[PDB]
Design an enzyme around this catalytic site. Structure first.
Site, PDB file in Angstrom:
ATOM      1  N   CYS A  51       0.836  -1.187   0.000  1.00  0.00           N
ATOM      2  CA  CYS A  51       0.000   0.000   0.000  1.00  0.00           C
ATOM      3  C   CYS A  51       0.872   1.238   0.000  1.00  0.00           C
ATOM      4  CB  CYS A  51      -0.895  -0.007   1.233  1.00  0.00           C
ATOM      5  SG  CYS A  51       0.049  -0.053   2.769  1.00  0.00           S
TER       6      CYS A  51
ATOM      7  N   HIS B  78       2.085   2.402   9.150  1.00  0.00           N
ATOM      8  CA  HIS B  78       1.299   1.272   8.689  1.00  0.00           C
ATOM      9  C   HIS B  78       0.399   0.764   9.801  1.00  0.00           C
ATOM     10  CE1 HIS B  78       0.433  -3.009   8.211  1.00  0.00           C
ATOM     11  NE2 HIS B  78       0.491  -2.817   6.906  1.00  0.00           N
TER      12      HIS B  78
HETATM   13  N1  NAD Z   1      -3.958  -3.768   2.829  1.00  0.00           N
HETATM   14  C1  NAD Z   1      -2.495  -3.532   2.738  1.00  0.00           C
HETATM   15  O1  NAD Z   1      -2.046  -2.438   2.858  1.00  0.00           O
HETATM   16  C2  NAD Z   1      -1.544  -4.747   2.469  1.00  0.00           C
HETATM   17  C3  NAD Z   1      -0.264  -4.561   2.015  1.00  0.00           C
HETATM   18  C4  NAD Z   1       0.544  -5.651   1.787  1.00  0.00           C
HETATM   19  C5  NAD Z   1       0.061  -6.940   2.023  1.00  0.00           C
HETATM   20  N2  NAD Z   1      -1.217  -7.099   2.466  1.00  0.00           N
HETATM   21  C6  NAD Z   1      -1.775  -8.448   2.740  1.00  0.00           C
HETATM   22  O2  NAD Z   1      -2.888  -8.553   2.150  1.00  0.00           O
HETATM   23  C7  NAD Z   1      -4.002  -8.881   3.267  1.00  0.00           C
HETATM   24  C8  NAD Z   1      -4.930  -7.696   3.427  1.00  0.00           C
HETATM   25  O3  NAD Z   1      -5.706  -7.657   2.262  1.00  0.00           O
HETATM   26  P1  NAD Z   1      -7.294  -7.997   2.376  1.00  0.00           P
HETATM   27  O4  NAD Z   1      -8.005  -6.866   3.137  1.00  0.00           O
HETATM   28  O5  NAD Z   1      -7.858  -8.063   0.987  1.00  0.00           O
HETATM   29  O6  NAD Z   1      -7.653  -9.414   3.238  1.00  0.00           O
HETATM   30  P2  NAD Z   1      -6.878 -10.862   3.289  1.00  0.00           P
HETATM   31  O7  NAD Z   1      -6.049 -10.906   4.546  1.00  0.00           O
HETATM   32  O8  NAD Z   1      -7.926 -11.936   3.344  1.00  0.00           O
HETATM   33  O9  NAD Z   1      -5.916 -11.096   1.942  1.00  0.00           O
HETATM   34  C9  NAD Z   1      -4.869 -12.077   1.968  1.00  0.00           C
HETATM   35  C10 NAD Z   1      -5.171 -13.316   2.878  1.00  0.00           C
HETATM   36  O10 NAD Z   1      -5.568 -14.628   2.031  1.00  0.00           O
HETATM   37  C11 NAD Z   1      -5.465 -15.575   2.936  1.00  0.00           C
HETATM   38  N3  NAD Z   1      -5.270 -16.888   2.339  1.00  0.00           N
HETATM   39  C12 NAD Z   1      -4.321 -17.807   2.257  1.00  0.00           C
HETATM   40  N4  NAD Z   1      -4.842 -18.825   1.533  1.00  0.00           N
HETATM   41  C13 NAD Z   1      -6.109 -18.508   1.195  1.00  0.00           C
HETATM   42  C14 NAD Z   1      -7.084 -19.195   0.465  1.00  0.00           C
HETATM   43  N5  NAD Z   1      -7.087 -20.524  -0.205  1.00  0.00           N
HETATM   44  N6  NAD Z   1      -8.276 -18.654   0.273  1.00  0.00           N
HETATM   45  C15 NAD Z   1      -8.561 -17.407   0.793  1.00  0.00           C
HETATM   46  N7  NAD Z   1      -7.621 -16.740   1.500  1.00  0.00           N
HETATM   47  C16 NAD Z   1      -6.388 -17.302   1.697  1.00  0.00           C
HETATM   48  C17 NAD Z   1      -4.223 -15.188   3.722  1.00  0.00           C
HETATM   49  O11 NAD Z   1      -4.404 -15.469   5.040  1.00  0.00           O
HETATM   50  C18 NAD Z   1      -4.098 -13.653   3.514  1.00  0.00           C
HETATM   51  O12 NAD Z   1      -4.046 -12.949   4.839  1.00  0.00           O
HETATM   52  C19 NAD Z   1      -3.391  -9.141   4.395  1.00  0.00           C
HETATM   53  O13 NAD Z   1      -3.183 -10.651   4.523  1.00  0.00           O
HETATM   54  C20 NAD Z   1      -2.074  -8.459   4.272  1.00  0.00           C
HETATM   55  O14 NAD Z   1      -1.099  -9.187   4.921  1.00  0.00           O
HETATM   56  C21 NAD Z   1      -2.027  -6.020   2.699  1.00  0.00           C
END
Ligand code: NAD
Ligand code: NAD
Ligand code: NAD
Ligand code: NAD
Ligand code: NAD
Lengths: 368, 337, 337, 368
Positions: free
Chosen positions: B153, B180
């Protein structure tokens, strides 16, 4: 004395050495834990808590899987399966369930045969079978070396119970219901994260979830004479670690004031319910009991009655610290509960003794 | 219109979905999801959000097999195989793997390898992925580029104007940091996280770390490397983060001069992408707002006219989606591959 | 022996109170103290703290007028006017003004009026005070300053190392920022406060701001001014905070070069004052910790051998008090008056 | 229709102001507040909220006394004493007691004095005359211009009443209590700093404030039929502006499940409690209660009973926003409950009301 270890590594896996090392009466000793994250972590983990502070202890990094505790060393396991864990080689008399996934002594049994003489259940295991082990209530009333996997009900109730115990014990109560303040934790994700439950799904430390408490049933589980009279809701709330319920209770008795019962608290708290039940007088909050091991914190003043009989009965408490003291509770108990000496059977009369060896005795094929 | 699936679909994806809806004429017909979570949950995952509140859009599931949002049927597959997820029954155009775990091209390719055709990730694509960010690389992105990603981000947010930063004055050196937020990726409660920082519970502690912002900085702009490189700070907040960067610019200036030099940025390029002001606003006063940030023109102070403060509550979450949703539209646009 | 009463029995009041118990060899006979707040509250408030926990120091007092704690029975009243606050009834030795509302020497004068002998102010006094701070203005300090001040923890902590860095490596330009916590200085709610930001609630929002640090640095460091200027970042935390500064140092160097240099200093002098390490430790790891701040060794990056990020979890409250305590007892010594 | 002012710029004042500008058909029209803090500040404050974010409507800052609420030019004062601030000059029909400072009607009297023809009290009771008035409960029970200094208690009561009122009306309340974890506010201390309630003298969103609330019993002050059945403490905790209670009292009727009563609450929440309650069976948390227009909201799914008698009433509410509507609920009711200068029934002509309107004497209005 008693050979101890921990299944896995949790915050409760982080909880007890704080007590244990800080303890002065612990006969047994842990020698290993399954930190599948490295001592460096585990130390940094254990040496530094998030709430009770850095471990006031020179728990030091001897070898990456065998570290120090102010000189006392302890090994480390790193795995997520009982069967490889050589509690036999480790000789561990007593291991603490740290997966949670063992909602079942069976899975805990996967360590019993693996050289766990006894298994410290920690949480409300969905496996009902294990006798419901709770201090002040049934702690002694537990049977040593009888199904050596030893239950431990939810701190919430586990702390509530002895209190909840003393009340009807002091009063006799038609029934009861309540709501604790289940502090924010990991189980409810900081994020609105995909969850088998709508509730703990949500972003944790902002929303405040009321939820299910078999702990309420667990009262009956530990207070069978009080069966059914129990209820309440598990209000998951955003705190680091303290829960507190007020218990709605139609007291079976007259309906005299609580202070009397609180005098009875002041009696029974000062009685056997020391260590757990505090009735402080200064109305105080979460911080006022952190690192304090009085495993229940009632407020006489704040506690009230409705019809004199429907008592509004509160008690502050931590959720793991006091719980971590429940560890020592059976620990030193089960320690002395451990036989050590021998038996006085008669392998002629009690040929079962001879059969304990001669198990293939037709002289012995009981019920089978 | 572009058939899309989302692996690891999450908040930012949900955000992207709340974006997608808010993106009236969303040229991504995202009829598919990968999410191992439950449907009603997945509904509530989108339906019930914390930050932007629940999705102001009702969610209906028929009955459990499929869920329809805004009158459009949607699917959500659930299998940890980076391929088995049936992206081919539709022959998916764009995939967004939230899990980020496939920092290698492979898993994304593995997603493409059964129907999917394009990729972007929240994780910075380590190596075998074009360093593609709106404001900076979405343009040089030729639509033949299929599997790309977004970096942090922070990286995502800083990118456009920090490019404009060295534009208007040139930057001797740059060391950025973020305010962050806290997430579950860092241990929200103490658990086995590689980063001992990100390992504790720390609902009120910060995490010293770094970011692709410190790394893709070169990948998004060549000179912007090392001297132009900082760290990351995951802070006890849930929301829009801020850039803790002071750019040692080349050309001597005073603060607003660069902000004057960055009024235009909003006035010409940062429009929609970013913003700027000096009325004091806080993350909530940046909530669900797509201009990735507003820069504290005032407190982006000049010091020695080279080492110049930069400060901007940046949408680590919604704009992050938005920018990606923007980037998604960009790839929804120019559709050849 | 120092018949002392401090103004504004805040946390730092309790802190130094606890420090009185904490720090050994306390000639600080602080048998009185001021806070217009309710004293029995303040007692319980003293008795019960959040962060360093309740001051388990049981106190037995007979009558409202006389209060005794840990043998050292200590008076306290509640009032606004230092003249309405009798000090000659004890012939007060020292006062510190935790209120902050007396941010000028007149109140101290008014405190000196009612029978005080010496004064210092933890807060940077507005105008009529040359502040005294250890590491910076404790050497040329004279006990013969019946009225002096400390600066905010920020300056009160950020001072020495970089001065010693300025001593050992110099700094062309310094861009200092903090993770400044919240306090009464800011409104819990969005209550009406001069600073809109400090006015806001910001339960999870930071305040972009600037404490007297980049200003008090002038006094405490007659050299480092303007060039060595950053701002403050008042964060939505209650507790131990972190320094966040990038410098453009003068002499060419690199990270570790300053570290051992920063080490050796604490290895002799910043001992107790400050610290440095690289073991990742979060806020909780700094409860009641006195070495004002351990500086990170890793993320303290160095660019062009001048652009140098600096980072250190610091105790804005207790270690501040510690530092506040530090010269406090020193002026108790050399007790010219 | 009715020029309105406030006791300073109450937070809920801003809250209702967000409502006010977004309010559908407010006959009354607030045109002035008291900001002893700078209009731009108060405007920003009014403009920029934390909880529901800034206004999605640009109030514009015309002069330091009168900005423009997206054009609507609303004035302000800078004081805490009405006696020098003539709402008369403002013709303000009703000043609102957005603070609690003049916890006494006579205190508010200084403002009927200072040019108010009516007064709204954003506060629970302190004395006796308090126009205890819950919309849904006893809204219509207002005498036109009877006690123009009119009282709206906190949602702690205000939200609390109707279903409770309804509950007994639906199921028969014998005696008991609810309790909420209440939000954090300034009425409790930011951190550990001066406040009589030690609890409200601490750091709140990091603790809990289990503390007395006569509101838990002030329900009688609108539901005296249920006087003597009431208890409950609130718990100021880390919530911005929301709460949820559970009136678990022994019920008069059978002791059947709640959902049934909640089905009738589903009726009632759509009945007298339309726009007021909401029996939402979906298990939803505080966030899912933002912009809580409805004065209340219920989760039957978790709403239950222990021994039937006591009722595990699972139901939520915002603490300020909804209240900021109870503002309007009462207010525009009073707009009807007080035809102002719109006097189409004079009777002060050839009928005695003339002299009374003109001047009392040994005359038309030669009263007692
Ligand atoms: N929002 C940011 O600024 C940012 C920046 C870099 C990384 N991230 C990563 O992206 C995630 C935040 O994004 P989000 O709000 O869209 O929610 P989110 O957390 O659900 O997106 C990624 C998640 O997918 C999950 N995962 C692993 N296998 C999976 C599967 N088969 N099916 C579904 N999910 C699975 C992981 O746990 C991971 O945390 C966080 O995990 C964060 O670590 C976010
Ligand atoms: N404290 C209570 O009253 C209570 C009540 C019921 C359940 N519980 C749950 O039971 C656990 C006890 O608390 P805690 O202090 O241990 O916090 P904890 O959550 O860190 O303990 C369990 C954690 O240990 C780790 N774990 C599980 N299996 C492991 C394995 N084979 N190897 C290595 N690590 C493993 C996981 O991180 C797991 O989350 C917690 O999960 C707690 O949430 C606690
Ligand atoms: N048949 C059943 O339904 C059943 C089931 C359980 C127990 N039992 C009772 O318990 C015993 C087991 O009955 P069963 O059904 O298994 O038939 P079984 O009695 O034949 O089973 C035991 C057989 O295995 C051998 N045996 C006994 N002990 C052994 C040992 N330690 N190691 C290796 N082999 C051993 C013997 O040859 C014996 O015939 C019987 O005495 C029976 O009375 C019966
Ligand atoms: N590092 C900094 O920025 C810094 C430095 C010095 C002082 N301060 C301010 O002073 C306090 C320092 O920390 P703290 O732990 O002591 O918190 P604190 O707010 O509790 O300390 C201030 C105390 O002074 C009292 N007060 C206000 N007006 C008073 C008056 N006329 N007379 C007597 N007492 C009065 C307050 O009640 C409070 O107890 C904080 O309020 C902080 O805002 C901040
Ligand atoms: N949040 C609610 O729904 C609500 C409603 C009524 C009362 N209350 C309680 O009483 C307080 C006031 O209600 P609120 O919600 O508006 O929060 P609030 O404290 O912000 O409202 C009072 C505001 O008006 C001003 N104020 C206070 N006293 C004043 C005075 N004598 N003269 C002029 N202005 C004054 C201040 O700006 C203050 O912020 C709250 O702190 C709360 O505890 C809350």
């Amino acid at each position: 004395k008693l050979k101890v270890a921990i299944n896995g590594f949790g915050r409760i896996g982080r909880n007890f050495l704080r007590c244990w090392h800080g303890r002065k009466d612990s006969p047994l000793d842990v020698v290993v834990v399954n930190d599948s994250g490295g001592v460096k972590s585990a130390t940094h983990l254990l040496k530094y808590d998030s709430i009770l502070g850095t471990f006031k202890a020179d728990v030091k990094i001897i070898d990456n899987e065998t570290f120090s505790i102010d000189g006392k060393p302890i090994k480390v396991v790193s795995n997520r399966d009982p069967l490889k864990l050589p509690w036999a080689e480790l000789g561990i008399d007593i291991v603490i369930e740290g997966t949670g996934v063992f909602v079942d002594g069976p899975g805990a049994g996967k360590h019993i045969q693996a050289g766990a003489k006894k298994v410290i259940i920690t949480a409300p295991a969905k496996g009902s079978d294990i006798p419901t082990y709770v201090v002040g209530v049934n702690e002694k009333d537990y049977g040593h070396d009888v199904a050596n996997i030893i239950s431990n009900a939810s701190c919430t109730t586990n702390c509530l119970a002895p209190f909840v115990k003393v009340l009807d014990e002091e009063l006799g109560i038609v029934k009861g219901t309540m709501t604790t303040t289940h502090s924010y934790t990991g189980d409810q994700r900081l994020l609105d994260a995909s969850h088998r439950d709508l509730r703990r799904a949500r972003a944790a430390a902002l929303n405040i979830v009321p939820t299910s408490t078999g702990a309420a049933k667990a009262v009956s589980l530990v207070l069978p004479q009080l069966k059914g009279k129990l209820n309440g809701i598990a209000l998951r709330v955003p705190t680091p670690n303290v829960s507190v319920v007020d218990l709605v209770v139609n007291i079976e008795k007259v309906g005299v004031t609580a202070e009397d019962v609180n005098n009875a608290f002041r009696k029974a708290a000062a009685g056997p319910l020391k260590g757990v039940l505090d009735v402080c007088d200064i109305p105080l909050v979460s911080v006022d009991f952190r690192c304090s091991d009085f495993s229940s914190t009632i407020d006489s003043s704040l506690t009230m009655v409705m019809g004199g009989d429907m008592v509004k009965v509160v008690a502050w408490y931590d959720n793991e610290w006091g719980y971590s003291q429940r560890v020592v509770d059976l620990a030193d108990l089960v320690a002395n509960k451990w036989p050590g000496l021998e038996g006085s059977v008669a392998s002629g009369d009690p040929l079962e003794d001879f059969c304990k060896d001669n198990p293939a005795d037709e002289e012995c094929k009981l019920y089978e | 219109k572009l058939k899309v699936a989302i692996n690891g679909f999450g908040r930012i994806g949900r955000n992207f979905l709340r974006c997608w809806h808010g993106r009236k004429d969303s040229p991504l017909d995202v009829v598919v999801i990968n999410d191992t979570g439950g449907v009603k949950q997945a509904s509530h995952l989108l339906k019930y959000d914390s930050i932007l509140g629940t999705f102001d859009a009702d969610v209906k599931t028929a009955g459990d097999s499929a869920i329809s949002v805004d009158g459009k049927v949607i699917k959500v597959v659930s299998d940890r195989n980076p391929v088995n997820l049936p992206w081919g029954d539709m022959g998916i155009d764009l995939v967004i793997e939230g899990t980020g775990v496939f920092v290698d091209r492979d898993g994304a390719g593995k997603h493409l390898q059964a129907g999917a055709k394009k990729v972007l990730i929240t994780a910075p694509g380590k190596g075998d992925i074009p360093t593609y960010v709106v404001g900076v690389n979405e343009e040089g992105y030729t639509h033949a580029d299929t599997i790309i990603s977004n970096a942090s981000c922070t990286t995502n947010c800083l990118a456009p104007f920090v490019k404009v930063l060295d534009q208007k004055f040139g930057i001797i050196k740059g060391t950025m940091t973020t305010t962050h937020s806290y997430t579950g990726d860092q241990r929200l409660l103490d658990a086995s996280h590689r980063d001992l920082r990100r390992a504790r519970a720390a609902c009120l502690n910060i995490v010293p770390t770094s970011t692709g912002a410190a790394k893709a900085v070169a990948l998004v702009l060549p000179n912007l490397k090392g001297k132009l490189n900082g760290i990351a700070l995951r802070v006890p907040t849930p929301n829009v983060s801020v850039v803790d960067l002071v750019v040692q610019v080349s050309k001597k200036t005073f603060a607003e001069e660069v902000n004057a030099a960055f009024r235009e940025s909003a006035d010409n390029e940062l429009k929609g992408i970013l913003s700027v002001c000096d009325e004091p606003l806080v993350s909530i006063d940046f909530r669900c707002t797509d201009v990735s940030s507003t820069i504290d023109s005032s407190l982006t102070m000049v010091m020695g006219d080279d080492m110049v403060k930069v400060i901007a509550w940046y949408d680590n979450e919604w704009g992050y989606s938005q920018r990606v949703v923007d980037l998604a539209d960009i790839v929804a646009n120019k559709w050849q591959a």
